[PDB]
Structures are given as C-alpha cells and as structure tokens.
C-alpha cells in the first residue's frame, strides 16, 4: 500500500518465528528499538502490529522515532517511546515500470503534523493561501497527494523500498504472540529459575489463594518485583517467593 494509506495488520494468537527474518539477508535495513533481535525469539507479546508501505531510499532514514520530513510528519509517524523493529528492502525489480510506476502516493501538504500511528487518507484540497478553496484544485489550492516516480533507471535514493514496521506492545497482560520456544514441566515448592511468558527470575513457585481477575497476568510487590504469575497453560495463580537467604 501507499505510504499515506499504509496498511496495518494485526498479529494475535500464533507462534512468532522471528528467526527467518533476521536470518534472511534480503533486507537492506533491519533496526530494532526497545528490544534486541537476539533476545526476541524468547519473548511473548500481547499483540503485534505490522504496518506496511512503500517509500524511496532517501526516506528510509525517516522511519524511526524522532525523525522529520514529509513521510515522518505527514504520512507515518512513530512515537518517541516506540518498541519494535523496522525492516526495509529494495523493491526496484517489483515496484518500477518502464513508464514510471505512479500507483504509490505520499501526502505532501497538511495543516498539522500527524500524531504517532495516525493514518490520514483524506483528499481535501489544501488551502495554502488566504483565498479559501471550495474543494476545487487551483491557485494556492493543492491536491495533498504526490506520486512517486519509480523507474528502473532511477538513482538508488529514488528507487522503491518496501518497508514493514513491526510494533510491540509489551504491556504486562495475557500474551498471544510468543516465540518458538518449547515449554517444560512446572516444579512447585522448589527453588527454580523460571521463565513465564518471557519474564524470568529465580524463586520458589508455590500455590496461592490470590484471585486474579481475568485481565490480570502478573502481580507485583511494593518494590515493583514480580509477586505472582498466572501459568500460561493452566490458569492457576502461582506465588513467586525469592529463594531463602540470609546473612552469614
């Protein structure tokens, strides 16, 4: 899809095999923010959002937090606290025509900057002068979308690039998108090194009488450490008590 009408896909309730992605070498750009690729396969997420569009190489640097430009300001803006990955690859062999591929558009004028993850597909005539426009193109009255060139003989800065922006919402909640990691059996009343939906630690896992609400996944103590977890396979609440200790 065109960058002004970037397509969003919702990924939920599936095992996410991120190995293929960072192991494939087709991608020209692969940069992650808030998390590292190596530590991604062993991590769960509440939801994953895949936003996909096409831009040119000059504008690839704008797909990042804290960036400015036509794409960042008027087409697709990422928040300053973005937690996800940006993947891009050159699609000159696919998104270019001998007469110029004019199907990919981008927004050129807008009265204000887009909020993060905002999608504007309005085609209202932009009023750039004092005279009001009555919906008709003309003098100081702009059509807000411009068409990309995209020709096989274009310079690399102007060749097409397909971009995918994976956004992760790490909020502590029931997970549906977990990595390709096999589970093990659970041992109660013993000091173990546990990993519950990507949350790791050391402690004794015991039975509890803490009535978690259907939307609650983790409990916390005053120190903000994990107090209890809900087993992702059997919906019971287990208390986590740090393994015994004391001064010597």
């Amino acid at each position, epitope marked *: 899809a065109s960058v002004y009408a970037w397509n969003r896909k919702r990924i939920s309730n599936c095992v996410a095999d991120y190995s293929v992605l960072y192991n494939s070498a087709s991608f020209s750009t692969f940069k992650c923010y808030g998390v590292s690729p190596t530590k991604l396969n062993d991590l769960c997420f509440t939801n994953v959002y895949a936003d996909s569009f096409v831009i040119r190489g000059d504008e690839v640097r704008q797909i990042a937090p804290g960036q400015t430009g036509k794409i960042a300001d008027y087409n697709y803006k990422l928040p300053d606290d973005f937690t996800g990955c940006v993947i891009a690859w050159n699609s000159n062999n696919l998104d270019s025509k001998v*007469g110029g591929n*004019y199907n990919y558009l981008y927004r050129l004028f807008r009265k204000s900057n887009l909020k993060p993850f905002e999608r504007d597909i309005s085609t209202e005539i932009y009023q*750039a002068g004092s*005279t009001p*426009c009555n919906g*008709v*193109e*003309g*003098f100081n009255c702009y059509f807000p979308l411009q068409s990309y060139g995209f020709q096989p003989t274009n310079g690399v800065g102007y060749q097409p690039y397909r971009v995918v922006v994976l956004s992760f919402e790490l909020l502590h909640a029931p997970a549906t998108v977990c990595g390709p990691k096999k589970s093990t059996n659970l041992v109660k009343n013993k000091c173990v090194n546990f990993n519950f939906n990507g949350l790791t630690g050391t402690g004794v896992l015991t039975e509890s009488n803490k009535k978690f609400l259907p939307f609650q996944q983790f409990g916390r103590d005053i120190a903000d450490t994990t107090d209890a977890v809900r087993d992702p396979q059997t919906l019971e609440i287990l208390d986590i008590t740090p393994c015994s200790f004391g001064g010597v």
Partner: antibody
Amino acid sequence: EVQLVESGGGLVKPGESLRLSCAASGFTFSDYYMTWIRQAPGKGLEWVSYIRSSGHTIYYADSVKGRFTISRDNAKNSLYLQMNSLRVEDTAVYYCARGGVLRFLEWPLNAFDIWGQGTMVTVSS
Amino acid sequence: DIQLTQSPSSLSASVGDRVTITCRASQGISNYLAWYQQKPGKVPKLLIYAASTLQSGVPSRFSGSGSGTDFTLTISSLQPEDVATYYCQKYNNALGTFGQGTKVEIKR
C-alpha cells in the same frame, strides 16, 4: 506535430450514451491536465469538464454533473468523455483542450493553448 | 463560482479604430485570464494568456491588460480580418469559466 484530434461525434437519441475521444500528439500528454468545453449552436463557449494530469481530481459543470464522465489513458495518450442520459440541450460542438503542466507550488500560466478541431453531437429523436 | 462578465455585447467600428473589450471577474483571479478570437463556425483561437502575454503568431495590434477582476483586451488598429467574437476565460483554478462573448462588427 503538437495537435489534438477529436472523434466520436454523431446523432444520438435522448437518453442514450455516446463516448468521445481526443488523441494527443507532439507533447507529453501525461504532464498536462485536460478539459472538455462545448458550444451549442449559435451560443457561446461553455466549460464542461476538467481532469487532472493523472486523473486524481475531476470536476464537472453543474449542467452535466452525474451524467458525464471524463477520463484519460496516459499510456494511450488519449482523453475520453462518456456521455450518458443525453438531453436535447446537449447538442453542441465539443472541444478538448490541454491545460498546463502542474509543477511544485505553481499553477501554470501557460495553458489552454492547444485545442481539438471540434466534433458535433446532436441529440434528437 | 467566479463569474465573468464581458462588455459590450456587440460593437461596430471602422478599420483602424481602437477597440476595447472589458472582462469583469466577480472575485480575484490574479492574472489567470486568457483572450480568444472565434471566427463564425471555427475553432477558438488563443490570442492572449496570463492576462497580458501575447500568443505566438498573433498580430501585435492585439494587447491585453488587467489583473484581479478588471481585464481589458485592446485592438489598437482594427482590421477587416478581425471580425469575430472574442471571449475571456478565467483559469485561476480548475473551473475554466468563459465570458458571454463580444461580437466585433466593422462599419464600412
């Protein structure tokens, strides 16, 4: 040779449909916006329709809104006008005219300098 | 929509006389105005564009002036082959509206 050649005029009964063609030569047709302008017998010039350089904006005179459709095929270097629900008052000589080259932050002052030869449309029983 | 008013409707003059046609725009159209000559039953011929720029091939006795809402076409020395109807057209936006036209007759 820079020119516009029109075709498709003829005799039509009221309510029927007729499609006009305008073939462009000698210039980059995809760089210009096109217009249709008609002139009824013994009457003045009337602007009919407008299509953008690549057709992302389209405008029609109120007398033809909902019944006329303007379109272009930049690859075929051609402009079309599909006229449905024709009326008797639609009888006129129709011209296609190339506008100007839309550039960045500039409405073109060089426009409407090349017209077709005209084609006659007569709507009658 | 901006309307164009042409004046006069009809006029008869003599060869060599100066002819002045006025085009009035209901709202400002900057200098996006053009002047056409149309001989009877013929394709309109562009004479002036950009309110004051003479089209190539047009005789230098034609001239255009004006800006905003008042525009005037001037034929310094009327000639026998100038008998036609003259139209003004705005093109400040996509609505290329025309005027009603001014028929120029010649007294002999």
